[PDB]
Write a protein that binds this ligand. Structure first.
Ligand SMILES: [Zn+2]
Ligand SMILES: [Zn+2]
Length: 373
DNA sequence: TGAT
């Protein structure tokens, strides 16, 4: 058992170091909890270890490098086989560690590595963004720690003394922000079947209510809109869960959560979202609140379909339009743009579904009627 | 809390 393989850390050491507030100052140390397993994952790990290292002065003593050195000697003492390794790390890898791990993974086909991170370290700096992409390209699976992973880390690596994991405040909100930020910097592309199923604008017949939202930013430069290549990606609604958001968090709200986190300066910005469902009343109300308190942001909403929330969605769309949002139904050019930009198309061109233009026309006339009532 |  992992309790016999490692010295479990103090609960205060865990909670202070793994708190997932995205901006968190004062932490002088990186912590790394790991398991080494066979290709069969269910059974107990072959070994488990806790590594720590000061962030400064030298990356060579970061826990990622300590792991690599330990693992290399450990493998000499054990019969060779394929290994799946899991890390729970308090900070994501710096540029030096990301490159060393990437080089190790790239030259060893027998090792597979998954890294769950509590916080993203310097996620806004291009050097760190690039290094995480290099690591992902070497085959490392990078994810944000969620409730289940904090709970698992607590059970395995912490001297909890039988007490259960207790989540800190805003663990879910932090997770969603970091998860969207990670997908952004790794340039995650949306699955093509997922795109086609969710942005098809024919009358909806599935029992599923899910919302996918693609977003982009432009900057005003010399009375011209220029792309801002930094903040481009997609996200989806968060389904309810008592350990996440008990009543869910809709895509439009998760989108609004990102904007302050980008730390846009005082220049004029146009933020565009392509959302498979138009926002419900509560989403459009929060969107209207945002516009009114962020006047350097011009909001543009393109929707594939109009969502009837059985409530005040028509008033919500009217309020959003009057407060200055541009609201429009997606036409062929916007579907093609999202396919070309946000979808893992593997070079394949946009293949429009039957009736795309006719459905866009009917929906545009319905939107027009809503906004003029 | 934008974090030697
Ligand atoms: Zn490092
Ligand atoms: Zn909504």
């Amino acid at each position: 058992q992992i309790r016999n393989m490692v010295e479990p850390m103090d609960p205060r050491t865990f909670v202070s170091n793994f708190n997932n507030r995205p901006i968190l100052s004062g932490l002088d140390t990186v912590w790394l909890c790991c398991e080494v397993k066979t290709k069969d994952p269910s059974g107990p790990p072959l070994d488990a270890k806790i590594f720590q290292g000061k962030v400064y002065p030298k990356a060579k003593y970061h826990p990622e490098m300590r792991f690599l050195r330990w693992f290399h000697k450990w493998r000499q003492l054990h019969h060779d086989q394929e290994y799946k390794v899991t890390w729970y790390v308090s900070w994501s890898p710096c540029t030096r560690c990301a490159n060393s791990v990437a080089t190790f993974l790239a030259k060893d086909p027998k090792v597979t590595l998954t890294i769950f991170v509590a916080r993203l370290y310097y996620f806004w700096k291009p050097d760190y963004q690039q290094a995480l992409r290099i690591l992902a390209e070497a085959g490392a699976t990078m994810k944000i720690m969620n409730y289940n992973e904090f709970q698992d880390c607590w059970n395995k690596f912490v001297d909890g003394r039988g007490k259960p994991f207790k989540p800190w405040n805003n663990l879910p909100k932090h997770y969603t922000l970091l998860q969207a930020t990670l997908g952004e910097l790794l340039r995650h592309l949306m699955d093509p079947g997922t795109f086609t199923s969710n942005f098809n604008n024919k009358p909806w017949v599935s029992g599923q209510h899910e919302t996918y939202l693609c977003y982009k930013v432009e900057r005003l430069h010399n009375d011209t809109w220029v792309p801002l290549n930094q903040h481009r990606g997609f996200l989806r609604n968060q389904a309810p869960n008592i350990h996440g958001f008990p009543k869910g968090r809709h895509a439009a709200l998760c989108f609004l959560d990102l904007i302050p986190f980008w730390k846009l300066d005082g220049q004029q910005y146009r933020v565009t979202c392509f959302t498979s469902w138009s926002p419900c009343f509560s989403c459009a109300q929060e969107m209207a609140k945002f516009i009114s308190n962020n006047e350097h942001v011009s909001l543009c909403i393109f929707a594939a379909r109009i969502y009837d929330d059985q409530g005040r969605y028509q008033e919500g769309l009217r309020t959003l339009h009057r407060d200055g949002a541009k609201i429009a139904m997606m036409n062929y050019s916007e579907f093609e743009y999202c396919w070309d930009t946000f979808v893992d198309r593997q070079g394949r061109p946009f293949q429009p579904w039957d009736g795309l233009d006719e459905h866009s026309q009917a929906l545009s006339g319905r939107l027009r009627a809503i906004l003029q009532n």
